[PDB]
Structure formats: structure tokens, C-alpha cells
Amino acid sequence: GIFFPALEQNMMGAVLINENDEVMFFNPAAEKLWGYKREEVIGNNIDMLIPRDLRPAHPEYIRHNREGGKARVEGMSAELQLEKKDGSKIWTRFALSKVSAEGKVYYLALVRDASVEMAQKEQTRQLIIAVDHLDRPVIVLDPERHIVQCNRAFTEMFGYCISEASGMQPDTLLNTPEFPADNRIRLQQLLWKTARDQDEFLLLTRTGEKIWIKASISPVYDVLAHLQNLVMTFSDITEERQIRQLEGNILAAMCSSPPFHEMGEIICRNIESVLNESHVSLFALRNGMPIHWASSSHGAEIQNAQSWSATIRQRDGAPAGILQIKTSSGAETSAFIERVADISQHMAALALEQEKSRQHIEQLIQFDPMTGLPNRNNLHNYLDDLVDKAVSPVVYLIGVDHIQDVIDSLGYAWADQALLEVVNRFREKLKPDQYLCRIEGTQFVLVSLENDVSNITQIADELRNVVSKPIMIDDKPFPLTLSIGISYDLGKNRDYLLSTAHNAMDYIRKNGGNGWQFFSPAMNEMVKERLVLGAALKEAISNNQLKLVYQPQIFAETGELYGIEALARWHDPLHGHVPPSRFIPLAEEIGEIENIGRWVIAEACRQLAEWRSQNIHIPALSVNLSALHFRSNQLPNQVSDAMHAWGIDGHQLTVEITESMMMEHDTEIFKRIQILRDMGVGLSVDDFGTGFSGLSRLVSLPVTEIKIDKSFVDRCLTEKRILALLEAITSIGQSLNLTVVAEGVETKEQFEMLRKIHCRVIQGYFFSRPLPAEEIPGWMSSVLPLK
Amino acid sequence: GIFFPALEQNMMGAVLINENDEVMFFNPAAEKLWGYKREEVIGNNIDMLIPRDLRPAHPEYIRHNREGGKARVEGMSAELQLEKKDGSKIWTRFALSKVSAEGKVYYLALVRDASVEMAQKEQTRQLIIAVDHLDRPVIVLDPERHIVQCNRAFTEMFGYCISEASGMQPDTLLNTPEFPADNRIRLQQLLWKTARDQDEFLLLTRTGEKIWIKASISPVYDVLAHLQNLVMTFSDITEERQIRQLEGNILAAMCSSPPFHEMGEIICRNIESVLNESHVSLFALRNGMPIHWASSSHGAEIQNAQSWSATIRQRDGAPAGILQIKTSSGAETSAFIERVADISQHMAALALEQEKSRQHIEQLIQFDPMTGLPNRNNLHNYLDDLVDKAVSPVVYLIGVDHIQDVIDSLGYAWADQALLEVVNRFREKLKPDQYLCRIEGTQFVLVSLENDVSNITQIADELRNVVSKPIMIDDKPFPLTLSIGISYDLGKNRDYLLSTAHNAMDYIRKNGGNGWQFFSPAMNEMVKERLVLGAALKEAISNNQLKLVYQPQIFAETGELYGIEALARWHDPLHGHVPPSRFIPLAEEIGEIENIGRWVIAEACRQLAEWRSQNIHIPALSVNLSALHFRSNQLPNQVSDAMHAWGIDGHQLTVEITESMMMEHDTEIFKRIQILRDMGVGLSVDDFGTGFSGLSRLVSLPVTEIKIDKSFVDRCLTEKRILALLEAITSIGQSLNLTVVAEGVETKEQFEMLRKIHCRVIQGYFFSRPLPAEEIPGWMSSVLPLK
Ligand code: HEM
Ligand code: HEM
């Protein structure tokens, strides 16, 4: 065969197999392709030329091809994996033909290597993937000036797919606006060949809208300087404007320090505003576990939705949260979603940092730039120390009401001023034993140690009253008010007391505010009982049903009555006998004490008047004004007019003054009681004033009696220490010519001691207990003397 | 021949040329490839099929090859363009061989249409331009994460080229810099994830520079849903991270809201830190003008300055300010400078919104919201109120300095906390009649009504040392200091009492952190004069420059001496003859009262010892020990040791005491005096006690002698009632030998008035001025008695 050397000297592998599939030819080209020697294959079966994984199957194909009867070969059209002798595989192609000669069918295969072809194919595939993941549209144009290569970004921006956009001129078939933006002319003026110049144009998409595009252009020449190719990089402008707006809005909102769940909503709503028709959400990693933070209002699902999941990480370290966004596919481009994701992530990180720093500040700071007062972070550390020492404080929970009116009408700036003015009132009226704090917002706490009802009611009433004068804020009155609750118990943890006080606050505010209450009912009905007692006292003093008793005072030596004293008494069927030591404080706290004094003065004068009219006379009655808390500006008028109403007998009436009530206060009364003194009223004292000035005002005010009170005469028996000052008092009286009376004597030893010390007049249980006006005349007529 | 008919049915193009170039081996595939028919080719020279450019050379090439005798065929490897019979052009690949048959040498050429491969070649050539133009580093990774593709941006950024960075790991080439914190694991995690993700890494370039980059990884899947490739995109974020640092710092400041002129400085400082060799200026709009807010002080030389002027606008959109930037040519990019301008203009926008809100109410609100204290308007009102009442106050201008320490160590919130702590100290030490306000920043004003320089100095010193303990916040100590300026007049302008105070404050602040000053012309030097007198008093009390002085006492009932008194006297020529009224309160203030206290009695004991050497008998001697302001800390020990210091009997020395010092503490003073009273030293007293004459009678027997102060005897012509006081004394005196000492006699009309009422002892100027030390050993010997 003359054509056999033609096959032999070729560079393409030649294989010839017969009807029996025995290989008849195997050139060095096939040798180098398969790694085999020609002797191994000449005259042998086609089996070894088949790869092992296909060897059981290929001979079936071989016999099927023979039995098919087709006159053409359709197999081996595509690439095939050729495994050589060592076991390594390559890509090869075949040009097999079917030959029928000498009454037998033969196969003549020419084998070529496609290694470089497959390598270039994979290269092109990886390149198209890279070009797709490029975040900016790219078009390659030629001197034929048709869109040759497209991009995924270009497809997603302008809607022209690869096949459609292929083979069309860019600046003529891409639809123009209806205006004079002559894209092709702009490109062809002086720019096409050499100018890397940019300009703004408008383009039309598949949806229908027209968008602004930058169309940066650049040519590429080969070595021969001929114009080889060209690149156009379309870039959007609405996207960049919206991204800048998103940054500005997020920073503008965040700089005002909103609450955490408001900042989350701000981020969500802004991401939505940039990308309409989407559902966004935020989770924060607390203790390694996500927690929901915010979401869009429209919680319904989105058809054909796609999700972008971004990890919110702080300035250094572990993730702090997870943002996720879902939006309908084909709505906005992938690069634009990615930009919004990056901006939102890098702002949520700052939100987390601010919240963390805020929590760190909250767990520490004690004072407050607003209100200038300690906040609860100091109240905790102070009240725990108080309660640790086993002393039981009294906690006042104060809540100012009706602040929203100012908050609305004039705003938060002036609401702060109103609250600051109230704080100033509290500061000006507090006391050194008290502690003031503000817990949250418009709720305050006052810690006191005056643990008794009498002080508690007084201080609570004063706190409630501090707001009697309306808060003035820029020439507009505002009548604020307070709801104040009291808590007090021993040994209980501060949670108990705080809870009780807050319960009282809630009760009073629900009832209507403007008031004060106790928690424990056992501590609460006492106020009601005292109010009932005060009402009873007021009604009785109005109705003139009080009583007077007459202590007798007798010379220790001669035995005659030196005088008597008027002692207030108070008996009521609904309450029983109540002593003055209890119900004079009640009169002082109710504000009816002036009328009590009026009654005692008038009744004593009248009761002396009946006896003086009768055939009996007594030296004087002492009416204990300062003991009855007579101290007021209107002292002399009543004493004078009551005396005038029954007769001019000034030498028979005497008034008592307590310890330093005439000097420290009531100067205008000390400067006027001289009128009574000149009228004829006597004067008696209990304690001497400040040294060299309280000496009966340098005996100016002609005091006549000193009353050694019971507190000393009860202990005179057991203390020569007190006996010494008793002797001094007696000597001072004797020297100054003052008379000395003793109060509260009971025993004969005490009387003898007073006699030897030379006490001039003695009163008490030893001689005669205080007795009524109906029994004083008989006793004074019958019994004389008691020495 | 059957190989020609075999390849007739083959897809391989084939041509064979003989000696005469007449083709006898040509197939329908070749007919399709070229266009000439078999009848037109067979027996015809091939030269008709050759492009015309090889007409004079093709046969010449055949002859040259034949003459050279190339045994092995290696030509026609390169792909060649071809022109068909109809003029169409394609690309073909040849395969040549040499054929020897019929005693002649023939040439075989197989031909294939290389269009299906040159399509891929022109595909990848065009795709490379697209993948390389945009300057964005993208890489493609296999399933095992080996890198397979890279582009121009990647090689120009990270140094490595494709050949070096082809077929290996994508992190070994991206090894982290020397900072080993977290990037070493962050890479290994991101690069091995299996979902879309992105992080920021510190990476070291091949040449050794440091780049902060943002890396994103995303997978691409084939049809069979298997993981096919991983594309990774990097991006340089150095400028972005600088902008993020700016944003973080400005948020960290504006969440605390420092003063306006400091927020401006913060913005400008960060601008200079983010921009290179630039200038920044910010202007607000007041009444329609550009008013300067703050500008960077970095006035470095700028070459070819580029200017930008953005109009920061309010919420309503009206222009409100100008953010003007000057940049060097080529220092920063247009996009960078525009972005920085936009960020800073939003920050400045919110700052100006705050400032415009604040400015509306600054002249109306009375209180100061930063600390709850009154504001400058309130001080204006207070000073107006005082000047209307014609009372000139003191205006201490407190300046809290070294606040900058907390400013640059922790920040503005902690600076406010420190201010709160200092004002809490101020209020806890504040007195009831002291007015306090905060004018601006860290400047407070304290207005009072004192006028004695000792009191003023005391207030200033207590204000200075109320901060002596450093403000402990988070256990970190900060030694704040204070500057104080004082202003006085008989009344001066309401704002001038602040400007003048600020003169002193500025003087002290510039010339030393901690201290205080009056005004130089009059009394800032007087303070120093008093301090010099204090140093002189220290010197004199150390070196016994003082001298005791003596003044006799004579029985009123004609008789001899009762006692000799002691008084401290001082005389230094440099300072003159300072009197007791001047140097005793100074002695207390300076802190050396104990020295004079012990000296006055040590000299007393020694002097009695010396006088005893002769016929001098010393009926009594009285050191004062009461006007010297003794404390209870060391009262008894010194007076006790003075006795045994020279062996003096306790029945001639005496002690005078005052109730004010006696009742400082009701526990220890009288207990200390008990030891002395047991010793036998007399206890005189002054103006009477307050405890109902008790301890004046029993605990210490201080009525051994009781005195009459100077202020009563001279005025005795008005208080004639003092006869009662003297009779009161004389009662107990005739009881148990108790004397009274009248003092301050000048003339006979007063002497006879004081003597007509029985007073034992008379002493004063009427008898003798205080004799110097040495005269008594003659005076006593001479005058006995005086009658
Ligand atoms: C690496 C070695 C081989 C591989 C990968 C292989 C695989 C294949 C496959 C899958 C086809 C059919 C393609 C299609 O239907 O689209 C084919 C075609 C064919 N190849 Fe093979 N085979 C191999 C070995 C051989 C050998 C050594 C011969 C020797 C003559 C041969 C002769 C044929 C025949 C007769 C057909 C049928 C063509 C037709 O029916 O149109 N094969 N080959
Ligand atoms: C468009 C058609 C053709 C062109 C442009 C062309 C051109 C060339 C060129 C440039 C060479 C030398 C470099 C190289 O071989 O790569 C060459 C070699 C050669 N060509 Fe062609 N040729 C064409 C067609 C043919 C055909 C159909 C034959 C048929 C036998 C042929 C026969 C040869 C021979 C014998 C050599 C010598 C190779 C050697 O000595 O190594 N040429 N041709």
C-alpha cells in the first residue's frame, strides 16, 4: 500500500482494527499518546486500548456499531478522556472512519491531542466567572464597534443579556433619551480613538425607566499601534447618591443617641428606603445567642426572594451580631445590595460599641449632669450601708405628677427646668440627717432616720407642701403636685422596703395623686385615729366641755395656802381620759392651741370670780401659758380682755414661762409682756436663761416665782449632786427676794429635805392632789394647816 | 488504494501533492473546506488553491525542501488564515508529512477548520481585557482552595504574579504581619468557609508594606449542585478605615456633647489627622453672615491649593454654615476629599442644630443645667438684688483647673463626672448664707457677705482643700487644683465684679495652678503682711520674745492684795508692739496656739518661784487660759506638768474658763478640769453658765471667784440692776467663802457705784496700769495697804 507510509509518517495517531477487532496498525504518534509500544498492540485484541473503567463496556459499543448498519460515525464527536499506560489521563479527540474492504469492515481512527484545547476551555470558563464577579459593568468593543463580551453586572443593570447584546453597536442601538444627548456623536467627536474621557449619559432599560450612566472609555492597541480593542465601564450614579444619603442619615440619627431598639429600627428603615420592597432584620449575639433587634413593618414573605447575610463585627474580635436582608430577585443589582450591606454593617458596629459603652457608664456613674443630684447608683451604696448597721431607715418615695403638660407645651428643654426647680426646692428645704436621690426620670427618694409617727407626718406634709407655690417657667405658671409614699421596717432587705414604697406610690397615683400614704395598715390606721381625735378635740373646745383642776400650794411652815394652779384636763366618752402630755402636742399639730389658751384663761378667771364674790378669798391662780404653748404674737390682748371681763384683780393671776422661750424666740412678746406686768400679773419661771443675760433679764422683767420642776425633786432624795443645786436655787431665790415653789413632792423625807434647804412653797401629792373646783372650797375652808 | 476512499468519508481534510503538484488525494471534507470540486482538483496543480502571496515561492519552497532533504517533517505547525474560492476567509490548522511512493517523494497535508478553537482564543483574549481593566483584585480557587486565576490589580497590589501564585494556598501568600492577634485564625476560617462571607484583614505585601484589606469569598456551583469554584475579591480599605476612625471618634465625643468650641476643635483635629497637609475652616451663619467657628492651626505651606466650599444646611434645608477645605495638589484624591467633606458636614450639621437650639434659650433660662447650679444670668440677678439693697458682697471666682488632665485621659463625660464630684464637695461644705453658681465651663462663682480678711482667707482655704483628696473615679486618682480671685469695693458694676475677678483668676492660672489672690493695689499685699506677722509670732514664741505682765487686785473693803494677774505682751521693733487683740486670733489661725498656751504658765511658775525668794508672798496668781483659746486635746497635761516643772504649790495658781469652750463637748472638758480642781488650782469663771447653774455649783466649784467682764462695769450707769447680780453672788459668797471680782474701774463716780453694793475685790485702771515685770518686788513692799 502506497498510502500506508502517508499514515506512518504523520503526526497523528493511526489505529486500524478489523472485523475481529484485532489492531492492525499503531504508529509512534499513538505510541506517545497511549504510552504503549506498537508490538503490544499489533495483532492483539482491542481490549487493552480501552481504559479499565470502560473496558467492560466499550466492546459492546464496538459490536453495536457493527450491527447498526449505519454508514456514518457519530461517536467520538466530543472530547474523550484518554488514560495512558502509567494510569494518568488526558483529553484527546478522534477522527475515526469506517472502512469496508475485502469483504470485511474495518475501523481507521486518527487520534489527536486536545490537551491545549481543554486547557484553554477551562481558562475561558474561569475567566468568565472572574469577569462576572467584578462589581462593575464591563464591555469589550472592537473596530467593528459591536458589543462582543458582556458582564453579569451589565446584564443586571441594563437588562441586555449576552445573546441579545451580542453583535450590536453600543452607542446606536442602546436606546437614547428623547433629548440631545447624542451618545455616538459624543464618542466619535475626538474621543473614540485615543481619549480616555468620561461623560454623563442617559440610558433606557428593559423595565422602562431611564438611568444616568458614566461611560468611561479606553482604547487598547496591539504592538503595531493599530486599534485592537476597546473597554467601556458603565457606572451608575443613583446608586452612589443613595449610598451617600444612607451614610448621612444613619450618622445623623445615631449621633442623637437614640435607644437601642430605636437605632435598630432606624437602620432597618433606611436600608428599606434605599432598597424598597424588602424585608430586613437584625440579631445581636448575647452570650453567644442571637436575639431579635429590629425588623421591617411589612413582615410578609417575598416571592422569589434572595438573602444577603452579613456579620456585624466590632473594631476587633468576635462577631457582635448578624444582619440579614431579603429582597425580590431582579429588584436591585448584587453590587448595590453589597454596598448597602457594607455600609449598614459598619454602622451597626458603631451602634453596638455605643450601647456597650453606655452600659459600662450605667453600671458605674454615681452623680448626674441633669439634676446635680446622686442617681440610684449612689442610693444603693448608701442605703445598703445604712441597713447593714441594723438601723432601720425610713424611705420616702416621691413622684412628681402632671409634668407631661409642660413637656408638651414647652418641650423637654423647659421640662428639665421645671424638674430642676423642684430639685432646688428640695435642696433648700432638706436637713443634714437626710439623703436625697433620684432613681429614674421623675422619681425621687428621701432617706430619713426620724422613725416615729410624729416626725414622719410632719416631714411628709412639708415635702408635699413644698409645691404649694407653682413652679414658674418663663412667665407661665404650672401647678405641679406630688404623690409620696412612706416605707419603714427593721431588718428587712431593701427590696422589701423599696417595693412597699413603690406599691404605695402606685396606689396613690391610681387613686388620683396629690397625696401621701403608708404601706403597712398597722402603721396606717394610726393617722386616721389621730385625725378622729383631733376632730373630737376641735368640736369639744368649740362646744366648751373641757375641764380644769386646781393644784394647791402651801407654805411649808405657816401652812396657809400660798395659791393654786390651773391644770388642763380633758375627758370624752368616746375616748376616755386623755392627759395634757398627749393632747397639747395634738393641739399644736392641729392649730387650735390659741383657743385652748383662751379657754383656760377665761375659765380660770371666771372660776376665781365666783369664789371671790362668795365669802372666800384665795391669793392667786397660776395659769401655765408656756406649758400650754401659749407662745404667739397675740399673747397680751386675750389676757387683758379676759381679766377686764371679770374684774381688775391683777395681783391674783400669774403666768408661767418655760426654758428660754422668751429669749431665743418671741422677742416681740418679751418686749410686750411688760404691759401685763405693769397691769399687775405676776410672773414665774422654770429654768434660767443664758449666763448673765437670762438672769431674769438682769431682774428687769420682775419675775416673782421660780418653780423647781418635778424632774429634780423626784431625784433630790438619791443625789446630793442635785441637792447642791437645789440649795443654790433656794439661796438665789432668798437673795433676789424671789419666791421658790417646788413641784412633784410626795414623801415626808423629801418634804423635810426641802424644808431644811428652805423651799418657801411646796405643791404636789404630799399635801393634796389636784382637785376640782367643786371640792376646792370645802377643802380650803376645812383643812388648815397641813404642816 | 483504499485509504483514499476511506478518508473520503472522514471529517479530516486531506491533500496530497506529487512531483508535478497535481493533487490525487482530496475528499468531500476538503471540498467543503476550500470550495473547489473533485473534478476541478484531481490532476490539477495545488497552486490554484494557495493564496496568491505564495505564487512565486510555493514551488520554490517545495524545491528548497526537496534539496535540503528534511527527513523529519516539522513545518506548518502555526495556524493559518485561508481564503475560499468565493472569497470567504477562515482559520485552518495543518498537519504535514512526507510520502515516498512510486519512486517519488510526495507531500501530505491534513487540514482542519481551526475556527472552533480560534473562537476560544479570541474569546479569552477579549475576556482578559475585561478582567484586567477595572483595577479590582479577584482570584478564583479550586475546591481544595488552591489559587488558579489572578488579575492585574491583584499582582500590582500583592506583588506576586500569576506564574508564582498559580497552584498553591491563598493564605501562605497572604501571611499576616508580625501582629499575631486574630488574623491568623480569621484568614484560615474565611478562606475555608462554605458560604458567602467577608472580613477585614491586616496583610503584609511581598515587598514588606502593611495593608488593611477587605476580603470577600463566594462560591459558584455547577449544574449538579456540587461546589465547583470559590471566587475571592479583595479591596483596599485604608482610606475607608481612616474615615471609620473619624466617625467613631466624633460619635464618641458628640454622644457626650462637649461645649461647642471644643466639638469644633475635635472635628478639625480629626480632619487634620485624616487628611495630609491640608487646611480646614468651619463657619456658622448668624443673621445671614459667615461667622468663624473653628479652623485648623496647621498653617503649613501649601502649593497649588485646591479649594472646596460645601454649604452645610439645617433640617429645613436653608444654608447654615460653610465647611471650607484647602488641599495640596496631588496630596488627596477628589473622591476622598469629597467624602471627608460630606462626613464632616453632616457632623457639623448636627452640632449646629444643637447650637441653634441652645442659643434661643440661653438668655432666658435662669438655672444652669450641667450641674443644677445657678447660671450667669442668676448671678447677674443676685448682684443686682444686693446692690439694690446697698450691700457689697465678696465674689470668689473659683476656677477648676487640671480638668484638661481628665479631658485627655478619659474624656468629657468623665470630666463632667469630676465636676459633679467637686460640686458635691462644695455643697456638702457649703454654708447657709453662701450663694453658688456656674458661669461657664469649669468656672464657678461663690458670693458671700463676709468682710474680715481672716474669715475670707478661711473660706478660700477651705474651698481649696475640699478637693485635697483626689477625685477617685474607677480607682484612678486625679489631683485637680483651684484658682480663686477676690474682689471688693463699696459697690461696683454687676459685670465688673466678674471681670475684675477674672483678672485675678487669669493671673493665678497663668502663674501657677493652685492658689488665690485679692487685688494687688491694696490687700493682696496685706495678706502677705499678716503672713509675715505670723512668721514673726512663730519666731517670738520659739525664742521667748514675749513677756508676762502683771496688774494688782485690791480688796474693796480696805485691805491688802488678793491676786496678781497675767497677760501676754509682745513687742518686736520690726513689727511694733502687737497687742493681744491682734496676736491671739493670729496665734489660733497660724496653728501655734499650744506653744503660747504652755509658755504663759511655764513662765508663770518660774516667776512665782523667783518672787518667793524675797518677802513677796503672792496671795493669789491668775494666768488666764481662757482668752488663749485652749482646746480639750492637751488642756490638762501641760497645766499639770507645769506644777512639777519648778515645784509650785497648787493653791496660788488659778485658771479662768468660759462656757463657750466648756460646752464644746459635754463629755471631756469638765472631766479634765476635775483633775486640776482636785489638785487645788482655783477655777474662776466669766459670764455665767447655762446648765441651770448646776456645774457652776457642783462639778468644779467655779464660784471660788467669779468675775465681771470689762464691758459691763464701764456701762454700769445704765444697768443699775447689776446690784441684783452682785447680791446674788454675795449670797453664796457669805454662805461658803466665794468671791467676786469687779474689773474696769476708771473714776471715783464708778468706784463708789461699784462699792456701794458689796463687792469684795476691785481691779482696773483706777488702781494701776499693768506694771512691767520687775516693778512688783518694790510696789508690793511699798503699798501695804492703799486705803
Ligand atoms: C480512551 C479510549 C476510548 C474512549 C474514551 C471511548 C469512548 C467512546 C464513546 C463514549 C463513544 C461514543 C460517543 C457518543 O456516542 O457521543 C465512542 C465512539 C466510538 N469509538 Fe470509542 N472509546 C475508546 C476506545 C476506542 C478505541 C480504541 C476504538 C478503536 C477503533 C474505538 C472506536 C469507537 C467506535 C467504533 C465508536 C462508535 C462511533 C459511532 O457509533 O458513531 N473506541 N468512543
Ligand atoms: C494558506 C495556505 C498555506 C500557507 C499560507 C503556507 C505557508 C507556509 C509557510 C509560512 C511555511 C513555513 C513555516 C511553517 O511551515 O510553519 C510553509 C511550509 C511548508 N508548506 Fe505551506 N502553506 C500553505 C499551504 C500548504 C499546503 C496545502 C501544502 C501541501 C503540501 C504546503 C506545503 C508546505 C511544505 C512542504 C512546507 C515545508 C515545511 C518544512 O520544510 O518544514 N503548504 N508553508
Side-chain angles (χ1 to χ4, degrees), chain A residues 445-489:
Chain A
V445 170
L446 181 64
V447 186
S448 162
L449 271 300
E450 295 177 354
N451 46 6
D452 55 349
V453 182
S454 66
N455 289 80
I456 289 291
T457 174
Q458 195 180 35
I459 183 54
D461 288 331
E462 194 66 29
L463 272 166
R464 176 170 174 268
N465 291 328
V466 307
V467 300
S468 67
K469 62 178 72 66
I471 293 290
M472 260 286 296
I473 297 291
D474 197 1
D475 292 331
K476 187 176 289 294
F478 278 117
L480 308 183
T481 189
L482 296 170
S483 295
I484 168 172
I486 315 307
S487 54
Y488 154 82
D489 269 327

Side-chain angles (χ1 to χ4, degrees), chain B residues 177 253 379 401 423 445 450 483 593 599 664 685 782 787:
Chain B
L379 169 54
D401 48 42
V423 304
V445 176
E450 315 314 299
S483 164
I593 194 64
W599 187 96
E664 291 193 348
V685 79
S782 67
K787 198 183 289 290

Side-chain angles (χ1 to χ4, degrees), chain B residues 711-746:
Chain B
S711 65
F712 283 164
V713 164
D714 59 356
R715 205 147 40 76
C716 195
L717 288 172
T718 48
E719 46 260 47
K720 266 81 74 173
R721 278 67 59 208
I722 296 288
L723 63 93
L725 162 63
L726 267 164
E727 185 68 28
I729 313 156
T730 311
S731 55
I732 318 168
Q734 75 188 2
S735 310
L736 70 163
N737 297 309
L738 305 187
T739 66
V740 62
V741 169
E743 184 266 322
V745 193
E746 290 198 329

Side-chain angles (χ1 to χ4, degrees), chain B residues 15 17 34 46 50-51 54 58 62 65 70 74-78 80-82 94 96 107-109:
Chain B
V15 175
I17 54 158
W34 281 271
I46 191 184
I50 308 299
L54 269 76
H58 187 279
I62 288 168
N65 195 1
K70 297 191 186 186
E74 295 186 328
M76 288 157 45
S77 61
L80 275 161
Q81 60 90 30
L82 185 135
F94 296 91
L96 188 67
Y107 310 100
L108 179 63

Side-chain angles (χ1 to χ4, degrees), chain A residues 213-497:
Chain A
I213 292 295
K214 305 280 288 208
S216 308
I217 183 60
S218 182
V220 173
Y221 319 107
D222 281 0
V223 181
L224 305 182
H226 300 176
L227 178 65
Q228 183 57 254
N229 272 126
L230 185 88
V231 296
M232 289 192 75
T233 63
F234 311 110
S235 71
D236 201 345
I237 315 185
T238 310
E239 288 180 353
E240 275 73 358
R241 187 175 295 113
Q242 292 279 7
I243 289 288
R244 289 174 65 248
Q245 210 180 45
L246 163 66
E247 288 179 352
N249 292 358
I250 291 289
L251 275 300
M254 193 189 288
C255 290
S256 75
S257 67
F260 190 82
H261 289 72
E262 178 78 3
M263 192 61 216
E265 178 64 28
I266 284 157
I267 289 183
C268 286
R269 74 173 71 186
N270 277 300
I271 293 168
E272 176 157 0
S273 69
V274 174
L275 311 161
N276 65 278
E277 290 291 330
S278 195
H279 180 275
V280 303
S281 81
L282 275 80
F283 295 85
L285 268 299
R286 291 291 175 265
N287 308 328
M289 189 68 203
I291 62 167
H292 187 281
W293 179 357
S295 174
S296 68
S297 61
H298 190 202
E301 296 183 24
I302 301 166
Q303 304 176 353
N304 308 329
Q306 292 183 358
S307 73
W308 216 262
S309 182
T311 306
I312 301 155
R313 308 174 66 261
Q314 71 280 340
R315 65 184 180 180
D316 195 1
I322 298 295
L323 160 69
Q324 64 159 326
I325 301 183
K326 61 177 70 66
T327 310
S328 57
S329 53
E332 284 88 9
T333 70
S334 186
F336 193 45
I337 308 288
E338 171 76 359
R339 283 166 64 90
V340 164
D342 282 332
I343 299 304
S344 59
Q345 180 181 1
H346 296 203
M347 303 293 105
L350 295 192
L352 267 297
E353 192 268 329
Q354 284 310 293
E355 191 268 313
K356 197 78 163 40
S357 188
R358 195 266 297 155
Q359 187 275 340
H360 195 285
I361 278 295
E362 281 291 329
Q363 75 91 24
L364 194 145
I365 279 177
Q366 303 286 289
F367 300 158
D368 210 14
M370 187 185 74
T371 75
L373 276 174
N375 53 68
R376 193 150 75 152
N377 287 345
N378 211 354
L379 176 139
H380 290 323
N381 296 16
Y382 172 85
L383 194 150
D384 65 3
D385 198 26
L386 278 191
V387 76
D388 199 2
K389 301 287 100 176
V391 71
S392 73
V394 189
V395 189
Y396 279 36
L397 264 288
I398 303 99
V400 54
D401 314 332
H402 203 204
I403 201 67
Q404 191 57 42
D405 61 347
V406 185
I407 292 172
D408 290 353
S409 64
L410 268 300
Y412 286 98
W414 304 87
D416 190 20
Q417 297 310 311
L419 183 135
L420 205 60
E421 187 73 24
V422 170
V423 168
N424 174 65
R425 284 188 182 180
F426 283 5
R427 286 263 201 71
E428 187 172 349
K429 291 198 51 51
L430 59 86
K431 288 184 188 43
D433 206 30
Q434 308 179 334
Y435 173 86
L436 189 64
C437 177
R438 184 189 67 94
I439 46 171
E440 290 86 3
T442 80
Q443 291 195 95
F444 301 74
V445 170
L446 181 64
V447 186
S448 162
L449 271 300
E450 295 177 354
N451 46 6
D452 55 349
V453 182
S454 66
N455 289 80
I456 289 291
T457 174
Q458 195 180 35
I459 183 54
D461 288 331
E462 194 66 29
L463 272 166
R464 176 170 174 268
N465 291 328
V466 307
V467 300
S468 67
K469 62 178 72 66
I471 293 290
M472 260 286 296
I473 297 291
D474 197 1
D475 292 331
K476 187 176 289 294
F478 278 117
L480 308 183
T481 189
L482 296 170
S483 295
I484 168 172
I486 315 307
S487 54
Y488 154 82
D489 269 327
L490 281 76
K492 309 305 291 287
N493 56 69
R494 76 165 163 92
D495 290 344
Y496 178 80
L497 296 176

